[PDB]
């Protein structure tokens, strides 16, 4: 049975001579009316309060997913030859015969095409547009491609043969859409990049800039230098003649652009050469930090070319990303780890004060708060590293690293390269969580427990499930999660949420091992997902 109130909330319950069990969510402050349709091989329910919520036990699991469409007054099931399965829905002064797409795939989407591999993109906070830098090793920028095409046509004619038969202009007219016929592209050291300002609502590219041939773009930032006014500026790192596998460059440059027209037009200011590939840029107390090669510079904007206001050259290997909380700065280099760094302002120094004790090929990082950083890794792990409590923020060796090191308080082998970690809240009013996405396409979240009771409970669920429902391929789940560094302080949600699919007798074995009943246990699983996430 399903119960809909008029303040948007809703209840489930299983039916017996009595109502036995319950669990309830919200569905909008407008009265919640329930309707019946059969869908994708199952009957399931609609419900509208302020948007339409399709609920279906997705192969024996309640998923209650909103739709992407306007509010409703009434509806009901419908089938036709024109629309083999769908909905009659009467709506704001309207009647609609609808059809519902793939009944999996938690997420919607809409796609806007690009040209190259998009390496990075930042949001202009006033206008809310995206600045994307795209790149491609082993490719051709548009100029060079058109030039080389027509040029090959020129050496076609020289065949001196019947001169008459001219495929030249035919060829030169022919352009097969690269998106479908492959990228007519090659070379070993030849990069090609592009910058694009793009509106996020509609796909239109508000603006575009095409760098030279052997220029690649590697990092971008959108800042507002303190000395000048409220003008926003765009800085785009750029490497010049990268060779990948041996490794050597000609050098770097740092394009600077003015971001005019309320946020819809890039226009050049000046490009300042620099002595290696500036691989990451960040705004910081009105001036811009730029990690180039192994050195870390504080730059400030002059009207001729960027100027150097400070520097540090101790950073170990090569700087891959840099993060800054208000005062201090987490450099993150490619091999060694996170390296903390303090910016003594009046005395104008950058001082290395504490850093991690492991080697860890960081790809991306993110700041949880003053003390702690959460960092992905390129082999597949996720680590979370916090400075120990008593450290001295401000100083001026030990184990060849800095004086005081940073403890590690969570290790976990996600499974796939994690390329972008970020802390936020998905549902409105649902508690902060840590969302990661990966390089295979998965999107997961990590979620902090609040109460030792629940933490110990989930621990025991998974510990028993581990042994009473081992993975298919024979791997041992504890080892798998402890591939590179041993697991520490994480409970696996996809082991635990497999209970619901075990076989009932074994369900019972476990359920009694905790002395609960399968429904009790299952509901207690469905909380964390229900309340933190989708």
């Amino acid at each position: 049975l399903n119960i809909g109130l008029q303040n948007g909330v809703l209840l489930r319950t299983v039916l017996d001579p009595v109502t036995g069990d319950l669990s309830d969510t919200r569905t909008g402050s407008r009265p919640v009316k329930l309707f019946r349709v059969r869908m994708q091989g199952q009957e399931a329910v609609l419900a509208m309060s302020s948007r339409s919520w399709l609920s279906y036990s997705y192969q024996s699991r309640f998923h209650l997913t909103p739709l992407s469409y306007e509010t409703l007054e009434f509806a009901s099931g419908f089938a036709s030859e024109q629309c083999p399965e769908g909905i009659v829905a009467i709506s704001t002064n309207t009647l609609r015969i609808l059809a519902l797409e793939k009944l999996g795939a938690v997420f919607n989407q809409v796609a806007f095409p690009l040209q190259y591999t998009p390496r990075k993109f930042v949001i202009h906070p006033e206008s809310n547009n995206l600045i994307i830098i795209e790149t491609d090793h082993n490719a051709y920028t548009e100029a060079t491609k058109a030039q080389r095409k027509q040029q090959m046509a020129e050496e076609m004619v020289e065949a001196a043969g019947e001169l008459a038969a001219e495929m030249a202009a035919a060829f030169l007219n022919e352009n097969l859409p690269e998106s479908i016929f492959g990228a007519p592209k090659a070379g070993n050291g030849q990069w090609a990049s592009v910058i694009r300002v793009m509106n996020p609502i509609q796909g239109n590219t508000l603006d575009l800039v095409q760098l030279e041939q052997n220029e690649a773009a590697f990092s971008v930032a959108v800042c507002r230098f303190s000395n000048t006014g409220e003008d926003w500026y765009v800085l785009v790192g750029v490497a010049k003649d990268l060779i990948l596998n041996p490794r050597s460059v000609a050098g770097g440059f740092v394009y600077t652009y003015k971001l005019v027209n309320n946020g819809e037009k890039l226009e050049f200011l000046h490009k300042t050469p620099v002595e290696e590939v500036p691989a990451a840029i960040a705004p910081f107390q009105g001036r811009v930090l730029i990690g180039v090669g192994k050195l870390l510079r504080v730059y400030d904007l002059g009207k001729k070319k960027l100027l150097r206001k400070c520097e540090n050259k101790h950073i170990a290997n090569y700087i891959s990303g840099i993060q800054t909380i208000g005062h201090r700065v987490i450099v993150s280099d490619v091999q060694e780890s996170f390296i903390w760094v303090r910016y003594k302002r009046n005395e104008n120094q950058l001082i290395i004060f504490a850093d991690d004790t492991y080697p860890r090929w960081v790809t991306t990082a993110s700041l949880l708060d003053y003390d702690t950083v959460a960092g992905a890794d390129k082999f597949g792990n996720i680590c979370v590293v916090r400075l120990p409590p008593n450290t001295n923020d401000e100083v001026d060796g030990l184990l060849n690293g800095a004086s005081q090191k940073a403890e590690v308080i969570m290790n976990y082998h996600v499974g796939e390269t994690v390329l972008s970690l970020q802390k936020t809240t998905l549902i409105p009013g649902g508690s902060e969580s840590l969302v990661y996405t990966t390089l295979s396409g998965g999107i997961g979240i990590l979620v902090p427990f609040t109460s030792h009771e629940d933490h110990d409970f989930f621990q025991h669920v998974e510990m028993h499930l581990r042994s009473e429902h081992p993975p298919l391929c024979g791997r041992d789940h504890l080892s798998f999660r402890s591939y590179y560094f041993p697991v520490k302080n994480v409970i696996d949600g996809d082991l635990c949420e497999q209970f619901n699919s075990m076989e009932p007798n074994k369900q019972k074995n476990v359920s009694e091992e905790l002395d609960r009943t399968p429904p009790e246990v299952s509901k207690k699983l469905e909380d964390i997902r229900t309340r933190y996430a989708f």
Partner: peptide
Amino acid sequence: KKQDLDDEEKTAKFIEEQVRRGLEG
């Protein structure tokens, strides 16, 4: 049983908050 009561209260907290937010909505 106390733990049961407790999580009942937890859920009541959740519903109250989300519905009062809808109320401002």
